[PDB]
Amino acid sequence: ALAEVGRELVDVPRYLERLRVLTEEALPEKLKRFLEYLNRSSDDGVTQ
């Protein structure tokens, strides 16, 4: 996601903006995945 960016001072704000964006948008992934996975159950093992 940032490997293409260079190694200069002008590149630094690109890194900072990407870091902020991923910080903001990682939490939605956490929610939409783990909250849905909270519905999982292990009834099959017990039943069988």
């Binding site: 630094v12 900072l16 870091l19 991923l22 995945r33």
Partner: protein
């Protein structure tokens, strides 16, 4: 006779895969965030 098991075992184990992958992705993203932050700190000190 033989009316054994070891068939439903994989069926039960199949559930964990998506959760494991999602957890891996989330942890990798968070690790990248921790890596990114000190760059911002150093840039602040550099501007000072």
């Amino acid at each position: 006779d033989d009316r054994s098991a070891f068939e439903r075992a994989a069926e039960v184990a199949s559930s964990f895969d998506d959760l494991t992958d999602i957890h891996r992705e989330l942890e990798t993203a968070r690790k990248q965030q921790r890596s990114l932050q000190p760059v911002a700190d150093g840039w602040e000190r550099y501007r000072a």
